[PDB]
Amino acid sequence: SHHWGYGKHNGPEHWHKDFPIAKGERQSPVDIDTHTAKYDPSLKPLSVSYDQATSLRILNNGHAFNVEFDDSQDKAVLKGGPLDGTYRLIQFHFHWGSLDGQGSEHTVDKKKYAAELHLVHWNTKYGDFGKAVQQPDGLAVLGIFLKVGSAKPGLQKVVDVLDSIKTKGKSADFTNFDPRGLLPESLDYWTYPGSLTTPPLLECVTWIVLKEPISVSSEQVLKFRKLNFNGEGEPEELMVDNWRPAQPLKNRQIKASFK
Ligand SMILES: NS(=O)(=O)c1ccc(C(=O)N2CCNC[C@H]2Cc2ccccc2)cc1
Ligand SMILES: [Zn+2]
16 A cells, blocks of 8 residues: 655655645745845744643554653643744654754754654643644644754653564553753744644644754764664664655745744
8 A cells, every 4th residue: 555655666756636725825945045044033932831740651653653641731832932822732742854964844044954843732622632633723742953963962852662662563661751842942932824734634733843943963963863663573664854845935934022
């Protein structure tokens, strides 16, 4: 069953055949032209409240790995910035490259980073994640670039469990992980209305992309690249280059929180 992925035969240039919204008016990711983005002095500071976050599990889903959270209560929430109301953290995942020069989905003045972290949150006025993805303001995804340099100490607990979820469908218990250890110092951001960056490509996301990248070590990102897209006992296909390239901005303005 020829399903979507990141290969020559099923990659992003093919997705529009099953998911015609792939060619829609508010697709993600996009290039962030830093000179064209306008400072919006009316944006509020972001509020990232992750002190009571409850991580549960880590899953290799065949496209990335997800660190999943208990989102049955307001434990880890994103508020403020461009957002109206309360968005609950459900999971985070990454997109990364085969080489340090590529891997991010968003670009900054056409610069590709080695990877991009997505902290996915849903608007609690819609009651569940599945209902939120049907709404134009359903999700808020906090995007953080990764560059290769110094290790990120707060990432290592993730890196060290990846050996236990090498292949598609594998999960492992992943309790007491603190996603505050993945944040940069500054919460300066760009924001624009967009989409999921994988099928079904629904146009339900407020994107909030932090200016300041986090640094990870070469050894940390090499461990991402040992994961597999394939199931156990299938021919090995390394989980690399699981990123969608930049899509046309169309009738959108990227707003900056900062001068
Ligand atoms: N890269 S992204 O943050 O836009 C993002 C976030 C979540 C999802 C997601 O998990 N989806 C999309 C919404 N329906 C459920 C599920 C389906 C899915 C499962 C695994 C991989 C990709 C998509 C996909 C992309
Ligand atoms: Zn993502």
